Design a protein around this motif. Structure first.
Motif, mmCIF file in Angstrom:
data_model
loop_
_atom_site.group_PDB
_atom_site.id
_atom_site.type_symbol
_atom_site.label_atom_id
_atom_site.label_comp_id
_atom_site.label_asym_id
_atom_site.label_seq_id
_atom_site.Cartn_x
_atom_site.Cartn_y
_atom_site.Cartn_z
ATOM 1 N N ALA A 159 4.825 -0.626 -15.499
ATOM 2 C CA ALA A 159 3.957 0.434 -15.997
ATOM 3 C C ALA A 159 4.642 1.791 -16.108
ATOM 4 C CB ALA A 159 2.725 0.567 -15.104
ATOM 5 N N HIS B 41 -1.501 -3.697 -16.648
ATOM 6 C CA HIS B 41 -0.963 -5.045 -16.504
ATOM 7 C C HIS B 41 -1.268 -5.613 -15.123
ATOM 8 C CE1 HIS B 41 1.554 -8.456 -17.457
ATOM 9 N NE2 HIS B 41 1.892 -7.915 -18.614
ATOM 10 N N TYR B 42 -1.225 -4.767 -14.089
ATOM 11 C CA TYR B 42 -1.695 -5.179 -12.770
ATOM 12 C C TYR B 42 -3.118 -5.712 -12.849
ATOM 13 C CZ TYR B 42 -2.137 -4.951 -7.625
ATOM 14 O OH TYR B 42 -2.316 -5.257 -6.295
ATOM 15 N N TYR C 70 2.864 2.120 -3.245
ATOM 16 C CA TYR C 70 1.940 2.620 -4.258
ATOM 17 C C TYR C 70 1.684 4.109 -4.073
ATOM 18 C CZ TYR C 70 -2.269 3.163 -7.044
ATOM 19 O OH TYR C 70 -3.209 3.586 -7.954
ATOM 20 N N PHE C 71 1.300 4.505 -2.861
ATOM 21 C CA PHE C 71 0.894 5.882 -2.605
ATOM 22 C C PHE C 71 2.096 6.807 -2.431
ATOM 23 C CE2 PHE C 71 -3.345 4.173 -1.091
ATOM 24 C CZ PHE C 71 -4.043 4.731 -2.145
ATOM 25 N N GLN D 115 5.254 -4.232 -10.569
ATOM 26 C CA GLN D 115 4.115 -3.653 -11.255
ATOM 27 C C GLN D 115 4.313 -2.179 -11.562
ATOM 28 O OE1 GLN D 115 0.662 -5.351 -9.440
ATOM 29 N NE2 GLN D 115 1.200 -7.049 -10.783
ATOM 30 N N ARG E 224 0.824 -1.200 0.000
ATOM 31 C CA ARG E 224 0.000 0.000 0.000
ATOM 32 C C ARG E 224 0.858 1.250 0.000
ATOM 33 N NH1 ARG E 224 -4.562 -0.576 -0.538
ATOM 34 N NH2 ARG E 224 -6.363 0.533 0.323
ATOM 35 N N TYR F 179 8.431 5.588 -18.455
ATOM 36 C CA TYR F 179 8.704 6.999 -18.245
ATOM 37 C C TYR F 179 10.132 7.124 -17.714
ATOM 38 C CZ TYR F 179 3.531 6.725 -18.126
ATOM 39 O OH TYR F 179 2.214 6.428 -18.400
ATOM 40 N N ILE G 104 -2.739 11.885 -14.361
ATOM 41 C CA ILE G 104 -2.382 10.522 -13.967
ATOM 42 C C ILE G 104 -2.171 10.417 -12.460
ATOM 43 C CG2 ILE G 104 -0.660 8.695 -14.221
ATOM 44 C CD1 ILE G 104 -0.253 9.603 -17.100
ATOM 45 N N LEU H 76 -4.471 7.663 -10.352
ATOM 46 C CA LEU H 76 -4.119 6.594 -9.423
ATOM 47 C C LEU H 76 -4.327 7.001 -7.962
ATOM 48 C CD1 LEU H 76 -1.072 7.001 -8.187
ATOM 49 C CD2 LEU H 76 -0.361 6.452 -10.480
ATOM 50 N N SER I 135 -3.251 -8.972 -15.096
ATOM 51 C CA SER I 135 -2.805 -10.152 -14.364
ATOM 52 C C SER I 135 -3.748 -10.476 -13.211
ATOM 53 C CB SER I 135 -1.383 -9.944 -13.847
ATOM 54 O OG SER I 135 -0.501 -9.617 -14.906
ATOM 55 N N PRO J 279 -2.232 3.546 -16.455
ATOM 56 C CA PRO J 279 -0.924 2.969 -16.806
ATOM 57 C C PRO J 279 -0.648 1.646 -16.116
ATOM 58 C CG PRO J 279 -0.704 5.314 -16.573
ATOM 59 C CD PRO J 279 -2.118 4.983 -16.143
ATOM 60 N N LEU J 280 -1.277 1.399 -14.971
ATOM 61 C CA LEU J 280 -1.181 0.146 -14.224
ATOM 62 C C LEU J 280 -2.217 -0.859 -14.704
ATOM 63 C CD1 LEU J 280 0.948 -0.288 -12.196
ATOM 64 C CD2 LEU J 280 -0.572 0.475 -10.393
ATOM 65 N N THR K 241 -7.345 5.522 -7.006
ATOM 66 C CA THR K 241 -7.475 4.078 -7.184
ATOM 67 C C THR K 241 -6.824 3.375 -6.018
ATOM 68 O OG1 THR K 241 -5.447 3.442 -8.338
ATOM 69 C CG2 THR K 241 -7.243 4.456 -9.637
ATOM 70 N N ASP K 242 -7.643 2.822 -5.209
ATOM 71 C CA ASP K 242 -7.189 2.035 -4.100
ATOM 72 C C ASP K 242 -6.590 0.719 -4.583
ATOM 73 O OD1 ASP K 242 -7.669 -0.024 -1.999
ATOM 74 O OD2 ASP K 242 -8.212 1.813 -0.915
ATOM 75 N N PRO K 243 -5.368 0.365 -4.169
ATOM 76 C CA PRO K 243 -4.758 -0.862 -4.702
ATOM 77 C C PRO K 243 -5.515 -2.129 -4.344
ATOM 78 C CG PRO K 243 -3.124 0.516 -3.603
ATOM 79 C CD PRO K 243 -4.471 1.078 -3.243
ATOM 80 N N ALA K 244 -6.381 -2.120 -3.323
ATOM 81 C CA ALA K 244 -7.208 -3.299 -3.082
ATOM 82 C C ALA K 244 -8.221 -3.527 -4.198
ATOM 83 C CB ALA K 244 -7.925 -3.200 -1.733
ATOM 84 N N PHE L 57 -7.400 -3.686 -7.324
ATOM 85 C CA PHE L 57 -6.755 -4.653 -8.204
ATOM 86 C C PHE L 57 -6.926 -6.068 -7.669
ATOM 87 C CE2 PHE L 57 -4.521 -1.729 -11.026
ATOM 88 C CZ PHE L 57 -4.507 -0.566 -10.281
#
Lengths: 241, 239, 241, 232, 239, 232
Positions: free
Chosen positions: A201, F172-173, A140-141, A197, A137, A205, F107, F111, F176, F169-170, F114-117, F119
């Motif tokens: 992605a 593929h996450y 990511y953030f 990941q 988590r 860049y 972007i 994101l 998959s 952009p994520l 977008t909460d990663p849970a 995915f």
């Protein structure tokens, strides 16, 4: 002099941002980075230790404290707001996923078999998988916050290398319980899952992502100095043990 | 704790096989420039002396003619270093320099030429690229095994003695099936390296692998690997 | 008494054949097998040590020496010819692939760094892969010899369990050179490769195949007694470390 | 549109074993639906016998030659390049040489005389065959891209057989010896030569339609973006 | 060195969770018959006392009512054994006896019934079968962790104290998707077992796994595993 | 015989997303060549719009319903069992709910919200969908074996889509997350339910013919002995 060490592993004038500040390895890296001439912003929720680091281990005076909980969302907007106005660009991000995570201290002991028993008794096994989610988590953030600043470091061209996000983690007090490797791999699995990941992605860049996993102070200096410097500009996706 | 003190190779007695060519060259340069007595071994003294008198920035590159395939020539070069210096700390063996054909004769840039190269190379030579690398890493370490431990006993550097293993794919690099030859070489050095790492790291000798791309990358690695920075680097393989 | 140990792990009246005889583990298994009442034929190329085993470690007098080189082909025809006429059936085959293999003795020392150097100097690295082929080759031809006798042990029904081929190996003098694990895994890879293929093709008959890989004498007794006895009749394809 | 999607009309194929078996089952499915199938086998009496017997449209062209000898290999394409000058499909059966289970005693002597290095040898031949089969047809196969008679890219489908080793109880050994053999070389060719516009695919070792299904789905334009795959 | 001396469990103070049912039953029987004080734990005293007074061949099976899910009931049973005997050497925890539903209500032998079972089981219950096994093995070891080391200090047996972990799939065994539930249970016990083996084998406690098929097979394993034969058996998992 | 080998004539299929996409590309290839394709989607206006527009023979039957709610699921088969009483193919698109890249700033906030849970949630829905999709059609699919209108066995082809996550952009996450999702459940169904005469197959996530190639090779008798395979 191209392959003279002082020019190869040069971090002179590199704008880094290190979550946790003192941390454990973070200090060991913050020292190695500023000492060789780099603007190191250190982030932590306890300003007194940020202030201690900035004026006791700083050899050129470039450690810049910044109070903030990485877990805390708006605090991240604050810190990106601050650096964009003061400097406007960063080149390195050393995020310690789960510095706002596992408890960095255990009040109970751990030596006697009984102390070990109650430590297990009050450790719900779901807290190990929670260590995973915390690290996944955070990276990511944390990456999300500095995304503009990180590519901003590509456009200002203060270094030949690409912008980099080095990810680390800690297990906190779990380093002292006998079930430490459980927490270690729980943490390692977290940062690598998110890193792979983000690399897929966003390496398209100007940001390569790298991992240093949790001993001497020179091991980490070598890594952080080889990785972020010009000597390590073509290294992306690796995991350094 | 500054870079000039950490990534120092000062007073390192290294031995780089292959003859200071390619990755080997980029490594002897990065090591001598930053202060190391580098012995270079090869079978063609003419090219060995050129690098010594053309690319050496401090004049501490010592050529030595010798076939790494020849065991007796390996015995000689070890005999020479044992009396001249008496100790080595780094060994950069390029497994398979006495291996695949370095230079290619026939044209490689035509469908016919590609066919011509395919017809005239027996596929067992890919397996042979592997086997040579296993032989070279094994026997090169065996030659300098005592000499390398002397580098721990003379204590001129804090790091443990090290054998960095690498290789080359020779003329196969400009054949369309280069990846085959590449991995054949990569598999050779790694398989033998883990066998040597398992068996001899308990004798205070670290083993590491650099795989067959700017001179800035190789300098970084070779200098990070051999210096006090990277003193606890054993078992890694570098892409 | 069904699950009383004396009845469960019973090898009473079991006709085994152990290649190498004394070997290292073979003795440790030949002892555990005859002591609990089993006709153990031991095979080796040096009859005096076969005779020593048969009348110094035999507690009921059932170790039956038989001179022969497993590598030697016609010697295998001789030994199968002998047992088919004396007993006519075997239930267990404990083949030590590469007892006729790597040199069981090294004249040179191995302590000083120089002794280690010459030991490596005269060890061609192809001899490690040769250790592989030796073990793969032996298990193939050793199983081949006793194939009729092995199923003959199924038709005579002296034991409730199925006929079994337990495969082992040794690295000989390579146990004393620092590059021992190379030889160990070279040997282990040999027996497992041949065993998996013999298991796939011939477990469909009355012969299950098993592997014990190379310490106390009770570890091996436990295994060999649990594996060959009635307690281990439904275990096939496993590899015991 | 089954008839237009799976169109193999005017496909210049070359199968190295279209009389041995499978090759036959697949040369049939290819010629019947309109593909000029050149057939290879080292006993020509049976190759022409297969032709003028299994050709449903009369487009099956035998040529005597064993795949192991390369001297036969330049012979075959030198002829094949002169009739057409271009090939689109190559279904190579690596290991054209290839290689009484009643009573255990017969089986004992059966394996007693099979040296286990012959299983490893089954591997080596298959690796060599795909390599030398591809090396032979490398120009002609890309020529099939320049003649542009089909929308799909040139393809080399690789297979092999274990022959008489299919009868010994240790057949899976030989099967995997061949299976590992053809795939190992196929992966090296795909990475190195797909960048030259040639897809490689593998069918591993029995119905007349399951194999037909495959050979037609891959050789048609339907199987135009399938490269590196393997099929049982 | 005969079987009667090697595979002896004489004077073994074992504790078998689950209540001497299924694999658990086949294990307490094989252990008591050959001489072991087996405490059996379960939540239904009625069935616990039946096995004690029906399948015990020497009368050394001691029932104990208790929920393994309940921590306080686990504290009680440990409190009882600590004063009555003071030491245990073997712990056969059946992770997930307080887990999946043991008995199935609806008919399982019809395409409709198979559909009926599929509609009324949320697929997260397969993940739950896993999670329960992780919880049970973890907390069962924690309860007897001191008690198990007492079994090394009383020295009534030469082997190290042992925690054998197993599990059950409950009613899912006669649903067509049993393998799913089986591996869900298998993965649970093994994942936790390696974490306990890594962390606590350095405290003189071996961990082993028997997976959820004649009573002759289970007797063999449980007796080979717990006896002096198999004193150097740690980290294995038994199919 | 392309027209007879790849015969889908009289195939009773049911695709849960034959309007969303791919489903459409595959419902077309199936109905055109003679298969009664029932189409599922939660916005019926577009499903019937797809019909009477893309039916080349007029055999496309829409029915409003979202796959997530099971109350819709008994609704759909209760109707579908009454028209025909038997199904042969099920192409389920697990995750029918599914889910301005210009400038880095957009972007960041993209994101940032977008909460990663979510995915990991993409995973969970796909595992649940194939399970409940199979559970719904389990009787009807085997009924298609008893009506014996086709030589092939009943089949459940499983797919899914990542929807709007295809744009972040994520992706593929999310890809998959979905790819692992459908395959994990597929392997559990294949082992447990292929013993009931039902093959399971997966196509993972764009040409109108590459997907057509697949759906026709698997749904025909050509793909009658292909079970447990996965296809890009």
């Amino acid at each position: 002099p191209s392959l003279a060490v002082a020019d190869l592993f040069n971090v002179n004038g590199l704008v880094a941002v290190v979550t946790g500040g003192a941390t454990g390895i973070g200090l060991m890296m913050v020292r190695a980075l500023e000492e060789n001439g780099a603007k190191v912003y250190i982030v932590g929720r306890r300003k007194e230790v940020l202030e201690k680091v900035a004026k006791n281990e700083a050899k050129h005076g470039n450690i810049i404290p910044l109070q903030g909980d990485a877990s805390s969302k708006d605090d991240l907007e604050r810190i990106v707001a601050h650096i964009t106005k003061e400097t406007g660009y960063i080149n390195l991000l050393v995020a310690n996923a789960g510095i706002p995570g596992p408890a960095p201290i255990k009040m109970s002991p751990s030596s006697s078999l009984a102390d070990i028993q109650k430590d297990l008794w009050n450790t719900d096994p779901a807290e190990f998988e929670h260590i995973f989610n915390v690290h996944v988590r955070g990276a990511y953030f944390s990456f999300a916050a500095f995304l503009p600043l990180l590519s901003a470091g590509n456009e200002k061209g203060n270094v030949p290398q690409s912008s980099q996000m080095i990810i680390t983690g800690s297990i906190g007090a779990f380093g002292r319980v006998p079930l430490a490797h459980y927490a270690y791999s729980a943490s390692k699995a977290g940062v690598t899952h998110m890193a792979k990941q983000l690399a897929t992605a966003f390496t398209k860049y100007g940001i390569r992502f790298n991992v240093i996993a949790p001993g001497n102070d020179e091991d980490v200096a070598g890594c952080i100095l080889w990785l972020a410097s010009k000597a390590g500009a073509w290294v992306s996706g690796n995991v350094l043990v």
